[PDB]
Design a protein around this ligand. Structure first.
Ligand SMILES: [Mg+2]
Length: 244
């Protein structure tokens, strides 16, 4: 029932430029009831709450955490979404395969969850290995999704997961339209957002992979901001004429 569904990544997007984070929040603060806010981060829910304390993030209506792996409503984790992503998902097999790549080192155990297997690519390893991994995983027949961001982070998620699939899910839940939705991102784990038909903005401080994506798929609903971090969001809101 609100006019805007604002979805944004936290690190290097909403957070990063404290001054811009603050004037973006002061603005939205005076029209708080006109938009649903959702943070789509690659962080765990707990990691995200921590960050909120650090920079003073405004309380959102939803948390699309761990790259869309888990969705937290105000009353708690969405168990429907979890049972939805659990179908045909076989983490142990995908992990066995992934663990076999010498160039891949597992990320902290706390970066993992039932639907997210994450690693770090060796700075000296050839990126093309990611292609090999993807292909090998896809052939298992298990609906798997490979997310590579900052030329270093690798995430193995269910095909149904994604920041974008979570976003679409949310739009369904809130009965919001793509034309009423704005997605903001900076890296490869945000690509799923722009794959969505919502209005999207790419921050200037965006990672190579995302920019590359834009040069090939960048559509008219996708805006390349002049500003970086939170500033790109105010810029985008003025661009698509949201919160008229
Ligand atoms: Mg990101």
């Amino acid at each position: 029932m609100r006019q805007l569904l604002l979805i944004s990544d936290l690190d290097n997007t909403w957070v990063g430029d404290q001054q811009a984070l603050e004037h973006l929040q002061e603005y939205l603060g005076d029209r708080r009831g006109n938009f649903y806010l959702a943070y789509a981060t690659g962080r765990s829910y707990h990691s995200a709450r921590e960050l909120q304390k650090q920079v003073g993030l405004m309380e959102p209506d939803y948390w699309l955490t761990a790259v869309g792996s888990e969705i937290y409503h105000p009353e708690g984790l969405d168990q429907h979404w979890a049972d939805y992503l659990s179908e045909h998902w076989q983490r142990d097999i995908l992990q066995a395969i992934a663990d076999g790549f010498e160039a891949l080192k597992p990320q902290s155990p706390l970066e993992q969850n039932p639907w997210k297997i994450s690693y770090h690519l060796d700075p000296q390893a050839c990126p093309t290995v990611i292609d090999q991994l993807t292909e090998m995983l896809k052939e298992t027949g298990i609906p798997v999704q490979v997310i590579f961001s900052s030329g270093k982070d690798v995430d193995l998620l269910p095909q149904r997961s994604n920041k974008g699939n979570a976003t679409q899910y949310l739009q369904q839940h809130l009965a919001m339209e793509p034309s009423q939705t704005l997605v903001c991102g900076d890296s490869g784990n945000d690509i799923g957002l722009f794959e969505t038909s919502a209005r999207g903005v790419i921050v200037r401080n965006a990672q190579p992979e995302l920019l590359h994506w834009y040069d090939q798929w960048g559509d008219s609903r996708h805006y390349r901001a002049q500003s970086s971090h939170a500033g790109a969001i105010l810029e985008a809101i003025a661009h698509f004429d949201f919160l008229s």
